[PDB]
Design a protein around this ligand. Structure first.
Ligand SMILES: Nc1ncnc2c1ncn2[C@@H]1O[C@H](COP(=O)(O)OP(=O)(O)O)[C@@H](O)[C@H]1O
Ligand SMILES: [Mg+2]
Ligand SMILES: [Mg+2]
Lengths: 334, 270
C-alpha cells in the first residue's frame, strides 16, 4: 500500500524537473573518477558545504555528434524525478557553453566491477546480497514504467555501508508501449534487443540473469573475442554453469536466461514475485534489505572524506569551456 | 591479464515507427540471399523482411587496387561479394601484413549493422569486382518498421477475440511479443478432429476450412478458431484445412496462461 505515493511523488517531479541549480565554480575539481564520452567523472570539493560530490561531465558536441541527445535528457529528467535507497541521488544539474553537468552523491566504494576482477568471484550469499538490491530497484523502476537498460558491474557502485548504488541512466527510458533502441552492453543484451523485436521490462530481467551469473561465476555466461559470436550464443540461450553452483542457483538462472518470453522470470503472471519467492531468495529479508537492516558482506575500505583509493587513475585534462555556447538549441530542455 | 578491461556500452541510432529499391538479377538475388541466411541478423527474418532487405542492398563495383574499405575507416556498412577477388591486410603497428583472401565469395562487416564498429582490416581489390553494401540505419529501419507494423496491429486480431475483450492493453502486448507464425499450404491439415486442443489460430492470409465428419465454417483473414482451446482442453471439436496458401498466428495456451493466468479468470473480470 505505501508504494503508490512513490508514483505520484515521481510524476510530480517528472513533468516539472529541476533545471539549472548551480555552476562550475562552486566545486573544486579534485580528481578524475571515470572517463566516458565526453566524458570524465570528477570527484569534486564543494566550496561552501565542503560536502563532496561526483560530477558527470558531458561535452554537448560529442553527444550531439553521436546521436545521443535524447538519451541525455532521458538520463536527467528521469534521474531528478526519482527516489530509492539504491538509486544514486542527484544533487544539482546545470549547463554551460560547452558542457552538460550532473552532480550526484559521490559513492566512494568504487565499482563492483573493480572488486570482482580483483577478488575473483562472489560467494552465493555475497552475490545474493547485491542481487536482492537490484531486484528491488528494477521493481520500483518498472512500477513507474522506466527501464534501466544498462546493467553491469561497471555500472554498480558500493557505498561505505557495503550496499549498492545503480549508476548510469544514459539508457534509462520511460516506455509504456514497446521501445526499439539497440543499446546496452554486448555481454548483457537480451535476445529481443539483438533482434530488433521491440521490447520493454523483460530486457532488464534478462540482464539480471547475466549479472548474477557473472557475480558468482566470476565472469559472464555469453563469451567470445568477436562480439557477433557473443550475440550468436545469446540468441540460442544455451549456457554452461560452473561446477560450483548451488542447484537452487542454476535453476534461477535458467529462468532469467530464458529466450522464450512466455517462460522468462519477471515477465510472467505473478511478475516479480516469481523471483522474490524463488528458493534461492529464501534467506532473503526483502523488507529488511529495503531498510538496510541487513549486514553487508564486504565494507569498502575508506579512509577520510574524499578518498579515492577504490578508483583507478586517469590522466587529468583541464576542462575547457568555449567562449561560445554550443548546441544550445538542442539542450534547452536540460 | 586484460580481464580487467571494462566493457564499454554500445548503442545504435534510434527510430520509433511512430521506397528504396536497387535493381538486380534473378540470380544475383538467390546468390546473395543464400550468402546471408547463415548470418545472425539474417538467419531469422520472415521472407519479406528478408526480401525488403535484398531490395535495399545497393551495388558497389570497384576498380582494381581500389580500397573497398579501409582499416580504421568506418562501418555502418556491411558488404557481400558478388564478383571479384580481394586481399585482406591489417596494420597492427608497425608491421603491415597481408592476412587472407577472398575469391569471388564471402562477406564482411555485419556487426556494423548493429552499432558503429570501425573495420579492422583494409580490403583491397585485386581486380575488377562488384559487391552489395547495406548501411546500418537503412537496415534497422526496414527491420523495425516491419515488426512494428507486422506486430501492432497483428491486433485487431488478438483484441478481436470475444474471449479476450476483457484484457488490459499491456497484457495484450505481452501476447503480441510471443505469438508465433505458421504458413500452411493448400490441403495441409491445420487442426484435427480429436486432438488435444492446445492453441488458437488467426488466419493472417489465405483461408482455412473447418469441417466435421460437410463444411461447418470457413475462415478468412482476421478471424480466429480453435478458440475453445482456451477454456476447455477436451479434444478437438472438428478439423481445419488450408484453402490455398494460408498463414496463421499460433498461440500455445500453456504459454498463454503462464503470462496472464487462466483465460476464464479474465472473462470474469467484467
Ligand atoms: N556517484 C559516483 N560516485 C563515484 N564514482 C562515480 C559516480 N558516478 C560515476 N562514477 C564513476 O564514473 C564511471 C562512469 O560513469 P557512467 O555514468 O557509467 O559514464 P559512462 O556510462 O558514460 O561511461 C563509473 O564507472 C564510476 O566509476
Ligand atoms: Mg557506464
Ligand atoms: Mg552511459
Amino acid at each position: 500500500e505505501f508504494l503508490a505515493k512513490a508514483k505520484e511523488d515521481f510524476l510530480k517531479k517528472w513533468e516539472t524537473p529541476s533545471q539549472n541549480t548551480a555552476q562550475l565554480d562552486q566545486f573544486d575539481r579534485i580528481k578524475t573518477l571515470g572517463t566516458g564520452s565526453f566524458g570524465r567523472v570528477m570527484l569534486v570539493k564543494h566550496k561552501e558545504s565542503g560536502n563532496h560530490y561526483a560530477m558527470k561531465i558531458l561535452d554537448k558536441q560529442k553527444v550531439v555528434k553521436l546521436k545521443q541527445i535524447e538519451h541525455t535528457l532521458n538520463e536527467k529528467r528521469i534521474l531528478q524525478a526519482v527516489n530509492f535507497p539504491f538509486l544514486v541521488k542527484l544533487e544539482f544539474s546545470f549547463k554551460d557553453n560547452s558542457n552538460l553537468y550532473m552532480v550526484m552523491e559521490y559513492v566512494a566504494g568504487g565499482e563492483m566491477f573493480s572488486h570482482l576482477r580483483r577478488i575473483g568471484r562472489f560467494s552465493e550469499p555475497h552475490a545474493r546480497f547485491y542481487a536482492a538490491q537490484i531486484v528491488l530497484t528494477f521493481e520500483y523502476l518498472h512500477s513507474l514504467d522506466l527501464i534501466y537498460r544498462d546493467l553491469k558491474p561497471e555500472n554498480l557502485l558500493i557505498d561505505q555501508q557495503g550496499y549498492i548504488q545503480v549508476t548510469d541512466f544514459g539508457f534509462a527510458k520511460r516506455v509504456k508501449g514497446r521501445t526499439w533502441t539497440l543499446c546496452g552492453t554486448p555481454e548483457y543484451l537480451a535476445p529481443e534487443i539483438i533482434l530488433s523485436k521491440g521490447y520493454n521490462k523483460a530486457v532488464d530481467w534478462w540482464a539480471l540473469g547475466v549479472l548474477i551469473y557473472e557475480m558468482a561465476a566470476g565472469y559472464p555466461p555469453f563469451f567470445a573475442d568477436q562480439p557477433i559470436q557473443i550475440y550468436e550464443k545469446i540468441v540460442s540461450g544455451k549456457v554452461r554453469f560452473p561446477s560450483h553452483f548451488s542447484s537452487d542457483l542454476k535453476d534461477l538462472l535458467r529462468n532469467l536466461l530464458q529466450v522464450d518470453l512466455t517462460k522468462r522470470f519477471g515477465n510472467l503472471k505473478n511478475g516479480v514475485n516469481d523471483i522474490k519467492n524463488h528458493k534461492w531468495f529464501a534467506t532473503t529479508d526483502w523488507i529488511a534489505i529495503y531498510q538496510r537492516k541487513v549486514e553487508a558482506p564486504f565494507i569498502p575500505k575508506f579512509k577520510g572524506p574524499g578518498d579515492t583509493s577504490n578508483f583507478d587513475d586517469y590522466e587529468e585534462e583541464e576542462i575547457r569551456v568555449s567562449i561560445n555556447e554550443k548546441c544550445g538549441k538542442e539542450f534547452t530542455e536540460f | 591479464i586484460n580481464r580487467f578491461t571494462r566493457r564499454a556500452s554500445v548503442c545504435a541510432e534510434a527510430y520509433n515507427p511512430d521506397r528504396i529499391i536497387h535493381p538486380k538479377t534473378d540470380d544475383q538475388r538467390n546468390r546473395l540471399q543464400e550468402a546471408c541466411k547463415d548470418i545472425l541478423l539474417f538467419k531469422n527474418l520472415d521472407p519479406e523482411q528478408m526480401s525488403q532487405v535484398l531490395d535495399a542492398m545497393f551495388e558497389k563495383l570497384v576498380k582494381e587496387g581500389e580500397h573497398v574499405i579501409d582499416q580504421g575507416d568506418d562501418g555502418d556498412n556491411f558488404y557481400v561479394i558478388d564478383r571479384g577477388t580481394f586481399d585482406i591486410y591489417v596494420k597492427c603497428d608497425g608491421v603491415g601484413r597481408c592476412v587472407g583472401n577472398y575469391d569471388n565469395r564471402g562477406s564482411f562487416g555485419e556487426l556494423a549493422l548493429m552499432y558503429n564498429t570501425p573495420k579492422a582490416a583494409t580490403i583491397t581489390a585485386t581486380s575488377p569486382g562488384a559487391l552489395w553494401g547495406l548501411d546500418r540505419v537503412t537496415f534497422r529501419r526496414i527491420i523495425v518498421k516491419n515488426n512494428a507494423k507486422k506486430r501492432k496491429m497483428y491486433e485487431s486480431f488478438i483484441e478481436s477475440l470475444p474471449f479476450l475483450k476483457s484484457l488490459e492493453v499491456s497484457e495484450r502486448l505481452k501476447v503480441v511479443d510471443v505469438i508465433g507464425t505458421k504458413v500452411y499450404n493448400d490441403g495441409e491439415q491445420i487442426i484435427a478432429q480429436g486432438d488435444l486442443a492446445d492453441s488458437f489460430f488467426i488466419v493472417e492470409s489465405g483461408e482455412v476450412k473447418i469441417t466435421m465428419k460437410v463444411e461447418i465454417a470457413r475462415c478468412f483473414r482476421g478471424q480466429y478458431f480453435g478458440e475453445l482451446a482456451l477454456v476447455t482442453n477436451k479434444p478437438r471439436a472438428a478439423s481445419a484445412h488450408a484453402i490455398g496458401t494460408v498463414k496463421c498466428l499460433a498461440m500455445d495456451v500453456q504459454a498463454f496462461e503462464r503470462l496472464l493466468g487462466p483465460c476464464m479468470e479474465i472473462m470474469k473480470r467484467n
